[PDB]
Amino acid sequence: WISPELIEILLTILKAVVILLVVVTCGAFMSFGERRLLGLFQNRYGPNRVGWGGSLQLVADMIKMFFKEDWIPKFSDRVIFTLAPMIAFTSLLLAFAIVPVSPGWVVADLNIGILFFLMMAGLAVYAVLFAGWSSNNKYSLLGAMRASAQTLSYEVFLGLSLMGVVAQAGSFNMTDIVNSQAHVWNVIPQFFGFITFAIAGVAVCHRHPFDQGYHIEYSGMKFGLFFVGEYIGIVTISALMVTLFFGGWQGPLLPPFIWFALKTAFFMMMFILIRASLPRPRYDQVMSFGWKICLPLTLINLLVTAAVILWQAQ
Amino acid sequence: STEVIAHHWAFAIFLIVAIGLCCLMLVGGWFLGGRALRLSAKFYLVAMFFVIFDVEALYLFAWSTSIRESGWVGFVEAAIFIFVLLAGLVYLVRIGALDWTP
Amino acid sequence: MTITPQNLIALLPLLIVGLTVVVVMLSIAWRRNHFLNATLSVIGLNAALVSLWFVGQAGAMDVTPLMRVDGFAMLYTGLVLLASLATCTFAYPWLEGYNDNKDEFYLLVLIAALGGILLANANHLASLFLGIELISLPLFGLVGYAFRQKRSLEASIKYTILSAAASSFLLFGMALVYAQSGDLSFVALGKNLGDGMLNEPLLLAGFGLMIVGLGFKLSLVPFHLWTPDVYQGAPAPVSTFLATASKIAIFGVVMRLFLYAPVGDSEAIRVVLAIIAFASIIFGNLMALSQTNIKRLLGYSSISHLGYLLVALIALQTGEMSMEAVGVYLAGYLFSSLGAFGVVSLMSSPYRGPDADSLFSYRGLFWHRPILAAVMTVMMLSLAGIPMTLGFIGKFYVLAVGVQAHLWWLVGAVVVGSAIGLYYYLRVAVSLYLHAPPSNWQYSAGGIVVLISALLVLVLGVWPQPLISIVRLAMPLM
Amino acid sequence: MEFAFYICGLIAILATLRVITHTNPVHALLYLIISLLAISGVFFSLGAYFAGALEIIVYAGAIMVLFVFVVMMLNLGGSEIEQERQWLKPQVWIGPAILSAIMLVVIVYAILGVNDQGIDGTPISAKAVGITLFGPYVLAVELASMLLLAGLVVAFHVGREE
Amino acid sequence: MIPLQHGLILAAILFVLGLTGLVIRRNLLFMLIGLEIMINASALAFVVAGSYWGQTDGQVMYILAISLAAAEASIGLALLLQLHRRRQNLNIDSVSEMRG
Amino acid sequence: GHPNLRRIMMPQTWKGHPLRKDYPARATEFSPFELTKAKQDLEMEALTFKPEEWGMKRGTNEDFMFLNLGPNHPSAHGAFRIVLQLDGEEIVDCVPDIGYHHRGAEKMGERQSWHSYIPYTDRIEYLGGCVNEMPYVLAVEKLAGITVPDRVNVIRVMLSELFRINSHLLYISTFIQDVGAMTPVFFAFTDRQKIYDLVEAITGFRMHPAWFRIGGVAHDLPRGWDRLLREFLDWMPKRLASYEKAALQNTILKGRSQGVAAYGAKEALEWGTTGAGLRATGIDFDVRKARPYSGYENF
Ligand SMILES: CCCCCCCCCCCCCCCCCC(=O)OC[C@H](COP(=O)(O)OCCN)OC(=O)CCCCCCCCCCCCCCCCC
Ligand SMILES: CCCCCCCCCCCCCCCCCC(=O)OC[C@H](COP(=O)(O)OCCN)OC(=O)CCCCCCCCCCCCCCCCC
Ligand SMILES: CCCCCCCCCCCCCCCCCC(=O)OC[C@H](COP(=O)(O)OCCN)OC(=O)CCCCCCCCCCCCCCCCC
Ligand SMILES: CCCCCCCCCCCCCCCCCCCC
Ligand SMILES: CCCCCCCCCCCCCCCCCCCC
């Protein structure tokens, strides 16, 4: 069984498995780091006793949530109730699945790329919809209608925000996107695309300030699945933002993984800072900002990007 | 090529391991531990606007990957497309279709 | 193939009506004004109608890998634009009594007119499909415009469900045709077959599925059951538009498709279309014998007249005046349906609420409305094939076309259906004069439109030579 | 390549068959979404990558979301639907199923008599689709935008609450 | 190496299944669902036909097909919401006011 | 002539009237049967809700829905219910369901001595403390004919103003948190900890000092109170400006708060509204100036 083809296949499989394991542990440790960073922002310490520096708090949470009594409501649909955390985890996980972390270190070098990210987000809205329906509660139903309306109102321009980087790269591939950032990172030309993608990625992750309850009927491992899927999705959006607007793994001196991890961790810290600082806007202004402002901004940005590209092509 | 079939195997392993990992943690959560309003039409309007603008967005998705090959003629065609889309959006905004509170 | 300035000036009615749609939408978004929006709509449609003359100056050519502009496109674009202008003119007094928003009606009429112009200019399967749906969806809006009324909502639901099913059938048929052929151009549907294997099973089945879809769209038997209910439930200007513009545009694109496709010469398709036309004439004439409602009777009339049109369609590959006969018949049928449904709309205007009935009560119309009764009986005699009417000239053209191609079964069907149509049309025209027990210039404009249609039918029935010369001048590309 | 096509086609057929014979609207829409995912897998196995991408982005990401939105808006608890079982009585479904089966055999006989060298499965990228879309199909794009606008206007006019 | 006939057979099977669901179901919602299945099957047939010939025409016609499908689904759901608002039921056989 | 004279403090299925002299003040024996049946009415209250019981009319037209916020709110203002008549998201009728926090403080006042009732006066407004103790001991001193010396007046004014600053800081923090910004409540609770340090030094307790007495205060001021007061007075204004610039000048908070539930002088006068609302209606009425007490004229 000694052959270079089988060795390469096993090595690529191990690389994908390593990427997935690092992502799930990074999401869980980022929930712990969200707690710690909220403590740091709010002039306190946070969890720092369970193990060295609180690093074993996540293990305690996992053990508690595994050994808690699993509950499914008596008057609820079992399949949909079980299937909502499945979507909330796996949809944005496989949205991460296209992100290139290093040259030669990728899971799938697809020809669609952030198109596949859009498929995964459109699948991810079903988690909120299914959790609202399967709870058999009208309060959670109305909350899910509101949350799904918000996520639709911002997914309506998520892809059009990514279209500026698509136009400047000329292809849907992520490797071509990070190769086109060899001189100037995409945050400089596609700045409006950058802010609109930031707002859209914040909104579709059900995070501050675009949130709300449909979580009340879940408990035990299903609530933990929703939680870790939310943080894994924040990791996914941060890494996609790094690979789309900040060159990804490209850097002058450090190894490419060091630059990619530094930019990703900076965007996670910026997520926690956004949660700590900004207040909650009301529904009407949130939907008005999603529709009236960001979508025409993305359309005008795409038009200006096309005009600049065709002007620069002699 | 060896690289492409290796990449397909890696993607298949990623999908299978992710789905099976979430299923396994669901099974473990189920296994461990002992035991003891009328909705308005504004949601429909918002979802329908999302659907229509998502199809116009898919047209723009198709255009954006081939801007250089289409030339200035494709830019003109997409300009009329985006102008019609923005006229529709302005029409929706000005009649109160996108306003939640009356 | 790219677009030239010559291709742009050949695109003038499409661009003008689209710019009218954008301008009307921006006017609605600025301030809801019924009069201003209707004026902008009719000015845009008239601008397209007069830019047809510049299109005729530009000549006949192929504008797209999709569209082709020639005299065929000129004639059918003019018919569709005239139908849309008459629809707006009849729609304003009906919309004067509407409590809800009125400006969306003209937007939908403009978009449906755009779809009709695209169907007139269509030289592609994609363009044919897009024109069919661009006609259908505004008709979904207009049929159920008065959705509070039960009849209009029911007609909208029936039309939407059945047209979605027929669009699925038509798209599956185009998919089978494209799988057989490999090119979606009209001329290339059968160019890859020779030496007597034109009757390929996949191509025949695909063309049969689009025949099903178009026979729904043309109220052909046995896809005709929607016609009286949708005609009755919809508003009367919507009934006018659905009777004239949609049928004219779809039959024009069917004419162009069957003329340009080499598989239209195949005998099995011609025999199937002969059976469809025979059954359509017989059924649409027999089913209107005992109708007390003018809208259902006019729907069965539309079924029978489209059967006569299909009879003229069958001899397209044999005769030489078959498309000329179709043009003359379609002009006469446009004017006949315009006059009849305009009289119906002027009696049904303004909209007197959704809870009140829209009953016609045509008995004794002469004793309070003499001019409208005269117009209505003129159009009733025109639809019967009675002489000194344009409908008689169209019926004579259909009869000559059927005589040329030895389609004697279809000719006997035309004679029998003409007798039955004579019975019910004369019953309506004589019920107008029995005994039974406005105030704005838009209503006067609608009355002027129906009076001009009646006078045009009378003059071109007495003297049909200018219309024949105009239709012969609309020569398509061989 | 062909393995994925056959498995996804069988999954889509089974899911649609469970769609048309189900009483729960949400379960029917879930099986419909599963069939859409399988049909997009069929698309990806045939090289039409843009077709599958738009199948899950739009067909399984906008249209089915709208259907689930409407279903949960109505709060359909199967009133006079779950308690009827009308489509499962053989006197109702034997006729239409026989008719659809007859049409299926006719279409299959038509399909089996065409030239077929097979599908090579070469991936047609979205770049070529966008080149053809804004090249030889400009009027298709503009009038499709017009059609989407018309559908939006009609659905706004009909689905208002007042 | 996949035959075109097998893809066309799959599309035909899905089309007649959607039509059967459109016919035998008295609910308007399941009728719209069956309509969605039929138009998706037609789009699948167009994609298979386009990929057999190696052309982008199939994908372009699919794009037009799903634009129509999205618009038609929106229209039918608006009409369904109007029917459920003004009649409190989705019985398609009970809405038969005009006939003959 | 009352539109709806139902019980507001006790539940509707309560026998007798508690503030009558023949009613026993002390707690009756507990029964799980009463609790279980009351759980049954708590279960069927959503199903058997009749708007005519609560004074609402034309309930369920069928364009109105009934919303119950309580009984437990996720806030520090207490636990209570509000039933709302709704058209979509618009409130047309609403009545609050109160009495979930009834402690019988008046009935307790009839069974405690004049001296032993002061800790009960603490827990009337539990963010007030000495502010709640002051009117009771002032009225008892009016009964006793006691004129307190000046040092007593200034000490009571000091503690009342300290607890007023504590309550105002907690109120501003909870309003900011209810808007959506959860950060400044931590810093303002640190400021409340500074106030609590001074109050612990003076009275020996944090929240309910029970330190005011009939005729004075329980102890003299501890040696070193002025140091803690000086550090607190130096600490406060920078933190106040920081909270202002962080949240009360934010445009999102202004959009959430400006123009919401506005009333004029007539509405405040006819409904007995006092304090911040009455002065926000333009009426200058503070008891510390109009009818001065505890030597407030010397400040
Ligand atoms: C709870 C579970 C529910 C069901 C979940 C899914 C079940 C199936 C799991 C096993 C899948 C096995 C692997 C399938 C093949 C993966 C590789 C692949 O698709 O390769 C084809 C193509 C390659 O692209 P490229 O390299 O660019 O090609 C150039 C030259 N070939 O690449 C592509 O075409 C890429 C695009 C297709 C990728 C599909 C990914 C999965 C989509 C479904 C997600 C479902 C999410 C959960 C449920 C949502 C609610 C229903
Ligand atoms: C195993 C028994 C059944 C077990 C339960 C069901 C599990 C899911 C089964 C369906 C999905 C997986 C099917 C198997 C895919 C395996 C990978 C494969 O066949 O790849 C081939 C090809 C790779 O790309 P290509 O460049 O064409 O490669 C040619 C090789 N030179 O691939 C392609 O070109 C595209 C590959 C397909 C598209 C991506 C994956 C789509 C997945 C859709 C899932 C739908 C929901 C299924 C739900 C099942 C449970 C209800
Ligand atoms: C990897 C992806 C994530 C990347 C992380 C880093 C970026 C995070 C981006 C977060 C974006 C949050 C956007 C919040 C939008 C809120 C819009 C809204 O509803 O505003 C309402 C408010 C009042 O509006 P009005 O209708 O006038 O109400 C007055 C009525 N009396 O209106 C106003 O007060 C006016 C201002 C509205 C908001 C403008 C945008 C502010 C965005 C937040 C600040 C970002 C600063 C830069 C952060 C670092 C970026 C690198
Ligand atoms: C938030 C970061 C998530 C990363 C997910 C993927 C992890 C893959 C690990 C790859 C390790 C080797 C990287 C290439 C070698 C060069 C760099 C070596 C030092 C890190
Ligand atoms: C043959 C083509 C049509 C020619 C014109 C037909 C008649 C049109 C209407 C003219 C006006 C008719 C007035 C009839 C009055 C009858 C009064 C009867 C009194 C007992």
From TrEMBL, chain C:
State one Pfam family annotation: Proton_antipo_M
Major enzyme class: translocase
Query: Where is this chain's protein located in or outside the cell?
Result: Cell membrane; Endomembrane system; Membrane
User: Transmembrane ranges?
Assistant: 6-28, 35-55, 75-93, 105-122, 128-147, 159-181, 201-226, 238-259, 271-290, 297-316, 328-351, 371-394, 406-426, 440-463
**Catalyzed chemical reaction(s):** a quinone + NADH + 5 H(+)(in) = a quinol + NAD(+) + 4 H(+)(out)
Membrane topology is: Multi-pass membrane protein
Q: Name one GO molecular function term.
A: NADH dehydrogenase (quinone) (non-electrogenic) activity
InterPro entries attached to this UniProt entry: NADH-Q_OxRdtase_suN/2 (IPR010096), ND/Mrp_TM (IPR001750)
- For this protein, the Enzyme Commission number is 7.1.1.-
Residues in domain NADH:quinone oxidoreductase/Mrp antiporter transmembrane?
122-420
One of the record's GO cellular component terms: plasma membrane
Which Gene Ontology biological process is one annotated for this entry?
ATP synthesis coupled electron transport
Ordered alphabetically, the record's keywords are: Cell membrane, Membrane, NAD, Oxidoreductase, Quinone, Translocase, Transmembrane, Transmembrane helix, Transport, Ubiquinone
Q: Does the keyword NAD apply?
A: yes
Family statement:
Belongs to the complex I subunit 2 family.
Task: Tell me, in a sentence or two, what this protein's role is.
Answer: NDH-1 shuttles electrons from NADH, via FMN and iron-sulfur (Fe-S) centers, to quinones in the respiratory chain. The immediate electron acceptor for the enzyme in this species is believed to be ubiquinone. Couples the redox reaction to proton translocation (for every two electrons transferred, four hydrogen ions are translocated across the cytoplasmic membrane), and thus conserves the redox energy in a proton gradient.
Subunit organization = NDH-1 is composed of 13 different subunits. Subunits NuoA, H, J, K, L, M, N constitute the membrane sector of the complex.
- Report the protein name in the record: NADH-quinone oxidoreductase subunit N
- Give the organism the record lists: Escherichia coli
TrEMBL record, chain D:
Q: What is any Pfam family matched here?
A: Oxidored_q3
What are the subcellular locations of this protein?
Cell membrane
Q: How does the UniProt record describe the way this protein sits in the membrane?
A: Multi-pass membrane protein
Q: What class of enzyme is it?
A: translocase
Q: Which reaction does it catalyse?
A: a quinone + NADH + 5 H(+)(in) = a quinol + NAD(+) + 4 H(+)(out)
Q: Which UniProt keywords apply?
A: Cell membrane, Membrane, NAD, Quinone, Translocase, Transmembrane, Transmembrane helix, Ubiquinone
What Gene3D superfamilies does this protein's entry cite? NADH-ubiquinone/plastoquinone oxidoreductase chain 6, subunit NuoJ
**What is this protein called in UniProt?**
NADH-quinone oxidoreductase subunit J
Native source species = Escherichia coli O7:K1 (strain IAI39 / ExPEC)
List the top taxonomic levels of the source.
Bacteria, Pseudomonadati, Pseudomonadota, Gammaproteobacteria, Enterobacterales
Which gene holds the coding sequence for this protein? nuoJ
